[PDB]
Amino acid sequence: HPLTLLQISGRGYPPAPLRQSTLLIIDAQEEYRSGALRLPGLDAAAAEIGVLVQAARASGTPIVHVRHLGIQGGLFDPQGPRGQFLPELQPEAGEKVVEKRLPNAFSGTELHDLLQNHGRLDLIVCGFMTHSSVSTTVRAAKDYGYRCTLADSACATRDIPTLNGGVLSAADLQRAEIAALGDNFAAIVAQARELL
Amino acid sequence: PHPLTLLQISGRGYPPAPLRQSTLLIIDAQEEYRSGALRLPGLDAAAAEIGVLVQAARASGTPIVHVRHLGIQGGLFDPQGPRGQFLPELQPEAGEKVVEKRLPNAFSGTELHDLLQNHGRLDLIVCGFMTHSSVSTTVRAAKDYGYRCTLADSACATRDIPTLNGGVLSAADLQRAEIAALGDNFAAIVAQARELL
Amino acid sequence: HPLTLLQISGRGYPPAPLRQSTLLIIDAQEEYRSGALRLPGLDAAAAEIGVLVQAARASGTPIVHVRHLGIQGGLFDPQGPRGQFLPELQPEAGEKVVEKRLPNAFSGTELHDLLQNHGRLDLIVCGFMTHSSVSTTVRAAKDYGYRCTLADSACATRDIPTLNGGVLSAADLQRAEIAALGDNFAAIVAQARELL
Amino acid sequence: HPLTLLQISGRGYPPAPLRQSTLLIIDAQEEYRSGALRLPGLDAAAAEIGVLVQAARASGTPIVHVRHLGIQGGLFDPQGPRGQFLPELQPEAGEKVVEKRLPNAFSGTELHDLLQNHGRLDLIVCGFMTHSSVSTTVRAAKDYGYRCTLADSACATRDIPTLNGGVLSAADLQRAEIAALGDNFAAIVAQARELL
Amino acid sequence: HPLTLLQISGRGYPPAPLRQSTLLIIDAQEEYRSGALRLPGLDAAAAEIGVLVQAARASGTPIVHVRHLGIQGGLFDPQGPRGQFLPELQPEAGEKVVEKRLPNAFSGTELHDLLQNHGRLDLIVCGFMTHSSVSTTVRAAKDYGYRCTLADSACATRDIPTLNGGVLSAADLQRAEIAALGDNFAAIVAQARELL
Amino acid sequence: PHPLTLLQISGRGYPPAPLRQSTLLIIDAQEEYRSGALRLPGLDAAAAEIGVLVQAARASGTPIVHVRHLGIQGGLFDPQGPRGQFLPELQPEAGEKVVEKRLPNAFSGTELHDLLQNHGRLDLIVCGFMTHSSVSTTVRAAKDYGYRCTLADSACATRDIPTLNGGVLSAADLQRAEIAALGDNFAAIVAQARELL
């Protein structure tokens, strides 16, 4: 059984419990339910993020919400229904919203400053899509020295094209991108309840 | 049954760049991957494809930037040991700049942003190892600076990695997924190096 | 579309599967990577030989490694790095090494005795350089009544001079030398995986 | 400007004049005129062999003829016209004939004995076909320590197939095979008259 | 008193303070304490480099270290004691090290790229030996359009031979080589403290 | 009592090269040093010794490369005035190439590396002006390309230069120190031109 690079280098870390982490929810937006990027596993993932949000709000764990700012008439249009939060994952009680324009939630934003104000090294990162904004933000978090913990069940993606007319299933892309992050960028658990 | 890429959906897609109009970025073509602890199964096949790009770039005056990972003493990418050295067939020649890095992101704590800026080419052709770590991370980071990235699938390689429930993901399946991911929102992808000539 | 002499003589044979063959690897030495004969197609050909070696070791196929014995200060110097096996193609599991001093791997060597003891009439021949040690050794094998199989992609050569200060490209030399072997000395396939 | 291996090794040698050599004529047979292998350059090449044969007979240079013995109803059939020498390159009384069954004119024959008896280290090798019997016999001569000289114009060959329904022209085959022999097995000249 | 070429050409420049400069430390290595090149003035010069290093670290001035790679087991032993930094002048934090094999620390190195990345035209150059690696590196820096400042006290050299079995003292060589640099390649001060 | 050179200590020293085996490289033998603003006290003595090397080289078919400094209008080495011209006794003759340079390093922004490679001799004999600036810089640069340099002390000259605290370093003291420095790690040194004939 192959070891992770984290294990080989001695720089690995256990999955962080929610109660000692900052919860970072990435792009829980209506585009993934009724827009151009309807994710087949959205409801299952949103249910798992809700389990984390409920436990975090009950314990006073910090929650940061990332929203993608699309363009007029495009994906995640902020003037349109597709740009809004999924109703079940709206911010409450002044939980901060970070508006981003690139897959990297740190890039051109106040995210770094906000996570520093909370003072927790451990980030629990969840949301969409696993292979783009989530993976990119997790990879960028390593450069600042954060530990990232992900639950596989709390992120989701879609089918994407491969070379020569092929298709890569959402489930195969998810498995690969979660394994890649587990290799050198994060601690991975299967389910949200493992972090409670 | 045929999904679009985000680049296609956003209208921001771009053609694969010809090597002649690009800066060639080679990531971590080091001896660790041949005679170290991370012996990649597809190293030779991929190094051959990088060699095709290197040979063509040297003949055309195309800029080549070599990235070298600085690891820890006596171990992975040992800076004072054979495992840290470039593969002999992909050694830099005079004039070709080397960037030494410590993290997967070749931009992070390095002069890479500066060098690519001074070359003045928005198109990067990125190749090297490993596909899912330093390559993917560096390509994703290039998007934040406004670079266009082109990759040949055959010019990158990786290794088997563990999954949940004591599974293994094969190098081939990790490569397929990680290239497709970059094709969705971070790069133009071609099958083989000769398509960039 | 001209016929081969093997086809005209009715003496043609199918490409041998690796599982029924002795795998013969010619001069996979550092001369060709870091010495005076750096072959541009070395890595592509070493990758294809590696496919054959992995499959041979998985099935108990015998592997014979030929190593050119050069002179001090010269090509394939046995006391210098240039004489040693490429690491990814080195002998494992006590696979035998045959040292040779001429292009013909049989000349002044134990090669005939070793092949005879394996008791397999089918040889799969790969390595370097296509037009010199590989071609010569394949042609010599016909005198002993071996059948030879080659993959085009598992051999490589270099640019060589012609009359009037011309240069023959490695690709043109390879194409011609593989076609000449296919005419009267071997079964030819494009790629290593076709012998799996 | 690439060097030959003979030059890199310091083992090179100049073309031998005919007067210091043994002339070895390979398979100058009727098969190539009226049989199944009608070489497009037969007459031009047989003319150049003729130049060397005439010069040799006038100066008492030894000439050894090689004749391929095929099987009844096959290529080089000895039981009909296609096995016989071209009339213009027939042996004249005193000149010995080596009859062979393989491409290597040494294999199972008196050739080594005849060449040792003439006591000339230099062989001039000419005839048919360049890539098969000529190339194989020249390569085999190296193992005995002979120096070989060929004139490109006194050898000929035919179109042969390549992979995927391709064809290599006789001229391309001839060019590559003479260059391959020039790299490590022979000194090459363009024309017979250069050896006079 | 005679003018420098920098004054005559009006291309002169004042000594740069440490706060506006990149600090470049050349070959502060164990060779000069316990190897074949024991500089009589090493401790006094290393003390003055230490003043600059301490001040640069306290004020966020960038520091680049150059290390010379010599002979396995011998001069500037690359992975042995003699090749290591003097313990008091070891790199800290993310201070970059340039390894060189020539007196010119720019030649085939990343130095130009690292200095350009720091964005400061003014270099303070110190270390060993004044007349060889220091002088060569300062001269080379003129071709890239850098301005160099040297403190005489923060460089050292050794006695060297002249013609006729003569000896040039470290003190005379230092005076001459620092003045040569002042003439066309640098701004000179007596002591490290004048740059604080 | 007698210290060793760094070249002796490293085992990579070489003897002085005879003129007959060398390319002769003559640096900035120009009228500025005779009738301009930089009148060298030792110019005539040095020019006599360079003349000996030029005469022997011309006699024996030894290649000669002339380096000339290109100054600015109205400045030192003005190419538009007499001060930028060659000293009459050291003018180039038919087929001897001239390299025009803007910096002390004669290789920098010039075709000097190309010309020297075209003559195919590893041994340069370097002479001319000034010892401590263009000569010293050019000899130091030569090491980076793998050349061996030979100098005659008598075939170079410099001038008095200021030191710290209003002091003066004499032309002779500067010469002795800069020739010794080149002998330490950059060159084989002889006393006079006739030792190379």
Ligand SMILES: N[C@@H](CCCC[NH3+])C(=O)O
């Ligand atoms: N006789 C071989 C020819 C291979 C040519 C490769 N250059 C075949 O039929 O496959």
